[PDB]
Amino acid sequence: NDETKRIVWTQTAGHCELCGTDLTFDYRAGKPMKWGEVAHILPASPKGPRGRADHDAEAHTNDTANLMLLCPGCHDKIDRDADGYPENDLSGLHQAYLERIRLAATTPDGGRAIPLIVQSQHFQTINDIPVRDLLTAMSAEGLTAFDQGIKIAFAAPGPRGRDTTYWQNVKDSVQYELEQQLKRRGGTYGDSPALAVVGLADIPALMMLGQSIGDRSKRLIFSFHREHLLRWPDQSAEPPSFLFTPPPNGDGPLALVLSISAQVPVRDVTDALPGARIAELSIPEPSYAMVQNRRVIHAFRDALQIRLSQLEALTPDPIHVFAAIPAALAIEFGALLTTQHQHTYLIFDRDKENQDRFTQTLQLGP
Amino acid sequence: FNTNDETKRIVWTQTAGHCELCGTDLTFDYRAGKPMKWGEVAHILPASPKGPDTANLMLLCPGCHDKIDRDADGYPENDLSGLHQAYLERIRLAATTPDGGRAIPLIVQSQHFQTINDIPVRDLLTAMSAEGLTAFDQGIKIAFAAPGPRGRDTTYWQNVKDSVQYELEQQLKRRGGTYGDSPALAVVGLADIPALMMLGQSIGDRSKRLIFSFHREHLLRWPDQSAEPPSFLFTPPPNGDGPLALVLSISAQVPVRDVTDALPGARIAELSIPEPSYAMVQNRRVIHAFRDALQIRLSQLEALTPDPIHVFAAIPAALAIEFGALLTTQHQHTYLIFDRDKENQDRFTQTLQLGPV
Amino acid sequence: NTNDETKRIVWTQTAGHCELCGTDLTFDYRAGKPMKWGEVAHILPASPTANLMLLCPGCHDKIDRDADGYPENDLSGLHQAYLERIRLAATTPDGGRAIPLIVQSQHFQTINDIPVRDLLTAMSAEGLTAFDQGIKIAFAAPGPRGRDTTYWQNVKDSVQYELEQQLKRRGGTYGDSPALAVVGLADIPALMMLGQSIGDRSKRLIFSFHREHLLRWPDQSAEPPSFLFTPPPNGDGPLALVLSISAQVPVRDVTDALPGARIAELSIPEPSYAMVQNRRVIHAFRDALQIRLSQLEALTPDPIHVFAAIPAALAIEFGALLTTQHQHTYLIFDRDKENQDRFTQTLQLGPV
Amino acid sequence: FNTNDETKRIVWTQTAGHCELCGTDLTFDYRAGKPMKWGEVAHILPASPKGPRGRADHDAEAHTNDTANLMLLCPGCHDKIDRDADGYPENDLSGLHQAYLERIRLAATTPDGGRAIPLIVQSQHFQTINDIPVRDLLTAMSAEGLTAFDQGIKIAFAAPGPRGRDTTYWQNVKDSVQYELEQQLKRRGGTYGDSPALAVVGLADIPALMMLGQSIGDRSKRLIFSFHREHLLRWPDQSAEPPSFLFTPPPNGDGPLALVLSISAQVPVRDVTDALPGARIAELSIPEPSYAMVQNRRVIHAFRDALQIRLSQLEALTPDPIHVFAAIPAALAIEFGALLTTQHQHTYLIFDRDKENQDRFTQTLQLGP
Ligand SMILES: Nc1nc2c(ncn2[C@@H]2O[C@@H]3COP(=O)(O)O[C@@H]4[C@H](O)[C@@H](COP(=O)(O)O[C@H]3[C@H]2O)O[C@H]4n2cnc3c(N)ncnc32)c(=O)[nH]1
Ligand SMILES: Nc1nc2c(ncn2[C@@H]2O[C@@H]3COP(=O)(O)O[C@@H]4[C@H](O)[C@@H](COP(=O)(O)O[C@H]3[C@H]2O)O[C@H]4n2cnc3c(N)ncnc32)c(=O)[nH]1
Ligand SMILES: Nc1nc2c(ncn2[C@@H]2O[C@@H]3COP(=O)(O)O[C@@H]4[C@H](O)[C@@H](COP(=O)(O)O[C@H]3[C@H]2O)O[C@H]4n2cnc3c(N)ncnc32)c(=O)[nH]1
Ligand SMILES: Nc1nc2c(ncn2[C@@H]2O[C@@H]3COP(=O)(O)O[C@@H]4[C@H](O)[C@@H](COP(=O)(O)O[C@H]3[C@H]2O)O[C@H]4n2cnc3c(N)ncnc32)c(=O)[nH]1
Ligand SMILES: [Mg+2]
Ligand SMILES: [Mg+2]
Ligand SMILES: [Mg+2]
Ligand SMILES: [Mg+2]
Ligand SMILES: [Mg+2]
Ligand SMILES: [Zn+2]
Ligand SMILES: [Zn+2]
Ligand SMILES: [Zn+2]
Ligand SMILES: [Zn+2]
Numbered sequence A: 001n002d003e004t005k006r007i008v009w010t011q012t013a014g015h016c017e018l019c020g021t022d023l024t025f026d027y028r029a030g031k032p033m034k035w036g037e038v039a040h041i042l043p044a045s046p047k048g049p050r051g052r053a054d055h056d057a058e059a060h061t062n063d064t065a066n067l068m069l070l071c072p073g074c075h076d077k078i079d080r081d082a083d084g085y086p087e088n089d090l091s092g093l094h095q096a097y098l099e100r101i102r103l104a105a106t107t108p109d110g111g112r113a114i115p116l117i118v119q120s121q122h123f124q125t126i127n128d129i130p131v132r133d134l135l136t137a138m139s140a141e142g143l144t145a146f147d148q149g150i151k152i153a154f155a156a157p158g159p160r161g162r163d164t165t166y167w168q169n170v171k172d173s174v175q176y177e178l179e180q181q182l183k184r185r186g187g188t189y190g191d192s193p194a195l196a197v198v199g200l201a202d203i204p205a206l207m208m209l210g211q212s213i214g215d216r217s218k219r220l221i222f223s224f225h226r227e228h229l230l231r232w233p234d235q236s237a238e239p240p241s242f243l244f245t246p247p248p249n250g251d252g253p254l255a256l257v258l259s260i261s262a263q264v265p266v267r268d269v270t271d272a273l274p275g276a277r278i279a280e281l282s283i284p285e286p287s288y289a290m291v292q293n294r295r296v297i298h299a300f301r302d303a304l305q306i307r308l309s310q311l312e313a314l315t316p317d318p319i320h321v322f323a324a325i326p327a328a329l330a331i332e333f334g335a336l337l338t339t340q341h342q343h344t345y346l347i348f349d350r351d352k353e354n355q356d357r358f359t360q361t362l363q364l365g366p
Numbered sequence B: 001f002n003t004n005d006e007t008k009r010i011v012w013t014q015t016a017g018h019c020e021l022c023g024t025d026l027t028f029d030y031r032a033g034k035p036m037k038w039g040e041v042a043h044i045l046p047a048s049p050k051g052p053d054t055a056n057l058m059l060l061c062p063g064c065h066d067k068i069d070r071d072a073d074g075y076p077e078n079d080l081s082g083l084h085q086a087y088l089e090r091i092r093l094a095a096t097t098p099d100g101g102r103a104i105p106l107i108v109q110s111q112h113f114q115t116i117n118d119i120p121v122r123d124l125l126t127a128m129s130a131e132g133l134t135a136f137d138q139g140i141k142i143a144f145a146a147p148g149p150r151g152r153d154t155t156y157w158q159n160v161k162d163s164v165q166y167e168l169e170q171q172l173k174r175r176g177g178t179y180g181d182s183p184a185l186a187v188v189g190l191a192d193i194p195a196l197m198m199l200g201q202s203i204g205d206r207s208k209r210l211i212f213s214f215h216r217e218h219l220l221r222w223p224d225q226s227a228e229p230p231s232f233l234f235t236p237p238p239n240g241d242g243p244l245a246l247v248l249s250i251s252a253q254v255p256v257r258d259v260t261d262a263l264p265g266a267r268i269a270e271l272s273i274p275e276p277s278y279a280m281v282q283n284r285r286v287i288h289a290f291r292d293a294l295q296i297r298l299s300q301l302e303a304l305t306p307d308p309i310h311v312f313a314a315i316p317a318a319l320a321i322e323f324g325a326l327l328t329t330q331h332q333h334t335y336l337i338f339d340r341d342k343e344n345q346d347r348f349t350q351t352l353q354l355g356p357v
Numbered sequence C: 001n002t003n004d005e006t007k008r009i010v011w012t013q014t015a016g017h018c019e020l021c022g023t024d025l026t027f028d029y030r031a032g033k034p035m036k037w038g039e040v041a042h043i044l045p046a047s048p049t050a051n052l053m054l055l056c057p058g059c060h061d062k063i064d065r066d067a068d069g070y071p072e073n074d075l076s077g078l079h080q081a082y083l084e085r086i087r088l089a090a091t092t093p094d095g096g097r098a099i100p101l102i103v104q105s106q107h108f109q110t111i112n113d114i115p116v117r118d119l120l121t122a123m124s125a126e127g128l129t130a131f132d133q134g135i136k137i138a139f140a141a142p143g144p145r146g147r148d149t150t151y152w153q154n155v156k157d158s159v160q161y162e163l164e165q166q167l168k169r170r171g172g173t174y175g176d177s178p179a180l181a182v183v184g185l186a187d188i189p190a191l192m193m194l195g196q197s198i199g200d201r202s203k204r205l206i207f208s209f210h211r212e213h214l215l216r217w218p219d220q221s222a223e224p225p226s227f228l229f230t231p232p233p234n235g236d237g238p239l240a241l242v243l244s245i246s247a248q249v250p251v252r253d254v255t256d257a258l259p260g261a262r263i264a265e266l267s268i269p270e271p272s273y274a275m276v277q278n279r280r281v282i283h284a285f286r287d288a289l290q291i292r293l294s295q296l297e298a299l300t301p302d303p304i305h306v307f308a309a310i311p312a313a314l315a316i317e318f319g320a321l322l323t324t325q326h327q328h329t330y331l332i333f334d335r336d337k338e339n340q341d342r343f344t345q346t347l348q349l350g351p352v
Numbered sequence D: 001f002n003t004n005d006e007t008k009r010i011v012w013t014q015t016a017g018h019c020e021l022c023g024t025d026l027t028f029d030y031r032a033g034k035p036m037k038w039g040e041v042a043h044i045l046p047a048s049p050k051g052p053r054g055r056a057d058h059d060a061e062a063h064t065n066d067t068a069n070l071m072l073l074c075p076g077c078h079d080k081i082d083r084d085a086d087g088y089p090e091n092d093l094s095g096l097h098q099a100y101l102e103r104i105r106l107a108a109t110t111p112d113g114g115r116a117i118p119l120i121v122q123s124q125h126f127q128t129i130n131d132i133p134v135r136d137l138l139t140a141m142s143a144e145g146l147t148a149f150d151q152g153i154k155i156a157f158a159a160p161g162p163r164g165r166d167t168t169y170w171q172n173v174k175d176s177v178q179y180e181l182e183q184q185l186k187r188r189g190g191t192y193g194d195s196p197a198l199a200v201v202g203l204a205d206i207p208a209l210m211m212l213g214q215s216i217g218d219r220s221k222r223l224i225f226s227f228h229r230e231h232l233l234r235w236p237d238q239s240a241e242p243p244s245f246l247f248t249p250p251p252n253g254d255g256p257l258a259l260v261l262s263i264s265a266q267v268p269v270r271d272v273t274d275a276l277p278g279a280r281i282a283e284l285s286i287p288e289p290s291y292a293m294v295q296n297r298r299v300i301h302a303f304r305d306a307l308q309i310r311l312s313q314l315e316a317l318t319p320d321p322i323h324v325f326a327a328i329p330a331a332l333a334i335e336f337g338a339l340l341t342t343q344h345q346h347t348y349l350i351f352d353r354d355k356e357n358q359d360r361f362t363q364t365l366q367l368g369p
Helices: A002-011 A072-080 A087-106 A131-140 A164-183 A203-212 A266-272 A294-312 A327-335 B005-015 B028-032 B062-067 B081-095 B097-101 B121-130 B154-172 B193-203 B256-262 B284-304 B317-326 C004-014 C027-031 C057-063 C076-090 C092-096 C106-111 C116-125 C149-167 C188-198 C251-257 C279-299 C312-321 D005-014 D075-081 D090-108 D134-142 D167-188 D206-217 D269-275 D297-308 D310-317 D330-339
Strands: A037-040 A067-070 A111-119 A150-153 A194-200 A219-221 A243-245 A254-259 A277-282 A319-324 A345-350 A358-364 B102-109 B140-143 B184-190 B209-211 B233-235 B244-249 B267-272 B309-314 B335-341 B347-354 C042-045 C052-055 C097-105 C135-139 C179-185 C204-206 C228-230 C239-244 C262-267 C304-309 C330-336 C342-349 D040-043 D070-073 D117-122 D153-156 D198-203 D222-224 D246-248 D257-262 D280-285 D322-327 D348-354 D360-367
Touching (some): A002 A037, A002 A067, A002 B005, A037 A072, A067 A072, A072 D075, A087 B097, A087 B121, A111 A131, A131 A194, A131 B081, A131 B097, A150 A164, A164 A203, A164 A358, A164 D167, A194 A203, A194 A327, A203 A327, A203 A345, A203 A358, A219 A327, A254 A266, A254 A294, A266 A277, A266 A358, A294 A327, A319 A327, B081 B097, B097 B102, B102 B154, B121 B184, B140 B154, B184 B317, B193 B317, B209 B284, B244 B284, B256 B309, B256 B347, B267 B284, B284 B309, B284 B317, C004 C052, C004 D005, C042 C057, C052 C057, C076 D090, C076 D134, C092 C097, C092 D134, C097 C106, C097 C116, C097 C149, C097 C188, C116 C179, C116 D090, C135 C149, C149 C188, C179 C188, C179 C312, C188 C312, C188 C330, C204 C279, C239 C251, C239 C279, C251 C304, C251 C342, C262 C279, C279 C312, D005 D040, D070 D075, D070 D090, D117 D134, D117 D167, D153 D167, D206 D330, D206 D348, D206 D360, D222 D297, D257 D269, D269 D360, D297 D310, D310 D322
Parallel strands (some): A194 A219, A254 A277, A254 A319, B102 B140, B102 B184, B184 B209, B244 B267, B244 B309, C097 C135, C179 C204, D117 D153, D117 D198, D198 D222, D257 D322
Antiparallel strands (some): A037 A067, A243 A277, A345 A358, B233 B267, C042 C052, C228 C262, C330 C342, D246 D280, D348 D360
16 A cells, blocks of 8 residues: 555665665656555466465555565666565565664664774785765764765785885875865864774784874774775674783893784794894784674773883883784874873794795884 | 645655654554554654754654743754754665675686686675675675696796786776775685685685685585584694694695605694584684684784794685685785695695795 | 677677777668678787687788688787777766756745756756765854955865865766856855856866756857957056956946046956856856966056856856956955945955 | 567667666676666657657657657666656657667777777875776777776875875885886786787876876887877767977086976976076977876877977987976876987986975976887
């Protein structure tokens, strides 16, 4: 009936459940118009597409679970290739679509924030965080934005690897490009904008990023995850214990090893920094997947805050960092150095141009 | 504040029929069973006070409409335009979610399996569609290049990788959707394990990418989405100074003797599942679980020695792709990948080196 | 050696033309005769449905000389090259993805509001297709500092911010950024900054608000007027460029504002507010203007003082022209509604 | 009153099975993979005068099978034009309709001209967006019979940092031209062949385009295209005659030898002497320096011919390097660079306008051995 059709239009918000197009407006010529169709998953005729002689059309005809709002072209397609769009497939997509709309309508407003994606090109594969997945994880926490945000992609390493020019580009990406793009947004978000930031880039560059947004109010760190993408793996998980080994007595450069994503072999630290006094922060079971929720990041921040103070009093010389940590925790490491820790930190990193030996990269200081 | 019919239909639709202040579904009377009295169940109020369009018309239930202080002309006394727009933006994001499924189909096989079990694009497209992944052009169907007289050497494998990445980087240029994102990659492989690990090496694991797994019975559809991942049991390597060898007994139990045969003095560590099997990839979480368990142990093994880890794997094709994609960080430990030679009595031989020399 | 389904696919994918000589094979329908698909053309494997070609009877006689149903030479390269050409043409409509941009001063936004609907229908007529809501901007009013360098730099940042956030929305067949369809209605200096913001090195199409035709082009067939240049007088006074395009600027009002000005001038025979007859008029104004600015820029290193009576679209293009790496100093003057419409300096472009 | 099947089959054919308004392919469903016709034959003028765009003076019986009145549309583009007759008037649609059919016919009747690698090189040193559309290059290529196996290479230089176009910037440029570009051309190798033709269009730093040309002039089968402020990638005028290129020779002396190119604009001699005191200026120009002067590729050939021998001459006149001050379009900067690949083995110091130093010419790249 006309009432059920109006309900199909309402609960779908007038978009095609299969492609997402807005069926309430014509953006080419600018006229509000209803150009959608209410499609039947199960046909009245059991000889039609997805027709089953063992089906009660007396009930499903008005069941909002048998009725999808589809643009004209998607309806043509599901009805002309029933083998390719079986009932089970379409009913699944149908309920999932309605759920996301309900969840969006019932999410309490949490405020505004600037989406910020920072990604490098130093991997030997594509490295691309989808903007949509960051905006979706923000929206699940009530956060919205006026624009799709800032997305900074570092220049790729040249023929000499990650050389001086490369690390200069990184500095210009963090300290100049990001600043300019944030300044261009002042008139819109104001002078107290929250930063919804996710990063997947060189560890030293994420630390530098963190230090340059560390004095920013309302910093929400998100995380790219190999299984869950921008979704938090498990909101109910407990942070691990961040085990700490203080460094041994003596002179020699003080090295801070962080074994969070993996166990950093001591033999690689002393190879690069002979005579190193190794202090180590680790978790019981190092793992790439350990960033289960933001409380894990806060817990890492809390544990590191205390150890950096201890180490900064155990030496007058720079602290040499050898880190195997997730990206989100590299940002947070850097954020601790913005005003709370003014000691000098020299960041070593794996060097593909040197058989995976650690070599010095950026220096982070006051 | 009064409005016309078309105006209310637009406000109800663009709000999904919920109160923008408390999120209550104002289609309640419909779900109960009573006829819908759209007019009495909700007050459509402008979002902003009077200050000298349907985008600034809100939908409020009567409760919230009575709590909002209004002036005599029906406008809100305080400015609700910020929450109104936020609420609309959250609905748009959800309603546009289907276009976040733009995807590239990728089928990679060996010249052999393209003659044996040639996977058709249609099998992948329907499995993709089922999960909301929507191709927009012909899929990429690739066959690994047969080796010339130089063989499968470093240059050969570098040309495979180069060839696979060229092919998809051109399709990843085809940005689209609401925000201009690159499409997702939907990939399935069927080739020898080393060649599959090179597929993972080419694609990585730092993008929106969904692996699929060929299965004769289900084709590229998941056998059982509800199945829980199996436990991945680990036997630590023995003490000694011999070459370190990681054995993966996932599809089957690799005879220890076959490993010692190909690698004299091999200290064997082994990840395995309680009941190895060819059909253990019941869904995608199985693949993720394998990655997590594997990397936890590779962390332990790489720290044991600077010398190469020798890999002897009886693992499903999908897991061989993920294994290759795992080892695409900047950090690289030397891995020497062994494969059974079907032309010489299934003896393990060294096919592929990964990482430093 | 083909079934009706295959012939239909080959006929559609090729647009009914012979893949070797390009003669139209739908001629029967065109003249008025019944369409005999299988008599006017032959389908043939390209090498000795994606690998079948459509050939006219003649070309078939020249390829299949042994009438064995296959060619004597591998024609796969020409066949596939042919289908690509067809595909690029058939998908050209998606090359029109576009962003509506309406930029007005707060004054014109109230007295002469341009509706998005007017721009969109002008765009659609030319094959430009918006996919989301249009951008509608109003120039922010200054503060007590007035229109200092900071004000104009902030106008530019806010315009570029919104502009670049929508140029991220790539799409179509090749992931191209969408085209910018922009119309402006504001004071001349503020329109020059809109031009400084958008540039002229991207797929961008200016539209023009016309007092009579609104955002539609008065006469797509109109030829552009000749642009007339009076070189400046010899001397050592400040250099001025008067643009009398929509009206004659009185030389006395230039010198009153710029004592001792050596006035060069660009104009048209019949200055008129309605002269923006089509987009070719805007292009022709740029070409003439740049040819003379090159002359004027080579005269002196000192700035060029600009007094312009020009349509709004020509003010944007003026601004867009001056976005190369090279930058001569220009001091743009505009009539102050407070000071009896006296030309005042309002905007500086380029070096101090 | 109802279009017949013969005419519907004609509409499908003359449109190659795509929507004349959005370009979607209406012969296949790429999501599930099944070939299918899902396009509709839409009528611009309806049989009923009350229909969308209905006219009373319209002889319906004499246009139901008139392909000039029938478009192939996707189901959604059909709902829209019939639900907003005012926003899709008869003349708008009719024009879009005939233009579509014309592009199809020009394609179908273009003689093949072999393959080429599409190549776009653009910088980010302007204060505005700078983006050459990929489709416009491919359409320019197709117009000359050239097709490609992929959409080609598109190289966007790193933007200048906070210090302007400093040493880091030009190192990035060199890396983009000499390393990244070579890398991408290698990976394509095998899809095109040993020595394929290049369809190259550039819009980047004048010194970078010269370096680009030098790196590819040794390559054979270079087809240069040009971005034009009015015509985009379409050649402004294929019939226009090349301009007269005017060469003023340098005076004998000891000053440094400067080559001034006044083509897009007149380079002031003050700015050359400011940066290079006592320069000996040899200038190549045209009667009316203009940004729009790249009317066709013959203009580019004529600029090449006008300096191919001049550079040899100038090289003998001085042992020191030749100092270049060029106001030229982006396509001639690529051509200038190609001339220097090996034909002219000599050091060339390329000066360019420095936004940091108040538009003064300052040295940037060095080109030669
Ligand atoms: N296994 C191991 N890794 C070591 C060792 N010494 C240094 N490392 C480095 O630690 C990082 C571990 O990877 P991650 O995924 O946990 O975190 C990285 C890191 O925050 C950032 C940059 O990556 P990279 O330069 O490879 O640093 C990698 C390793 O070299 O990005 C994160 N990241 C990279 N890829 C992903 C991804 N797919 N998803 C999420 N985050 C990612 C050592 O001894 N052993
Ligand atoms: N039982 C057993 N297998 C061993 C042992 N040592 C090594 N192997 C190898 O493990 C693989 C197990 O087969 P799979 O189907 O689980 O996975 C294969 C593999 O990922 C890839 C190539 O196959 P192959 O070279 O035979 O490697 C096979 C075995 O030799 O493709 C997968 N694959 C092959 N055929 C199919 C198929 N029909 N369907 C799905 N996946 C397939 C050892 O000791 N024992
Ligand atoms: N007659 C005359 N005009 C002079 C003189 N010195 C300066 N001017 C300015 O030239 C412009 C002429 O009007 P226009 O419509 O051709 O162009 C204006 C201009 O581009 C922009 C802002 O308007 P304004 O600040 O008045 O500049 C007006 C004049 O002051 O907007 C354009 N514009 C204004 N109204 C409309 C409209 N209704 N439709 C289209 N464009 C409009 C001088 O000596 N003499
Ligand atoms: N007017 C003028 N320009 C001078 C002078 N001395 C040096 N120049 C430089 O010459 C070029 C003139 O502009 P163009 O468009 O004719 O050529 C440029 C050039 O080939 C390349 C990079 O631009 P840029 O670094 O600004 O060089 C500009 C100028 O600084 O790209 C070309 N280019 C730039 N913008 C476009 C565009 N929109 N469309 C097409 N090509 C473009 C001097 O005295 N006067
Ligand atoms: Mg149906
Ligand atoms: Mg239909
Ligand atoms: Mg023959
Ligand atoms: Mg119709
Ligand atoms: Mg329809
Ligand atoms: Zn749809
Ligand atoms: Zn409420
Ligand atoms: Zn022919
Ligand atoms: Zn369409």
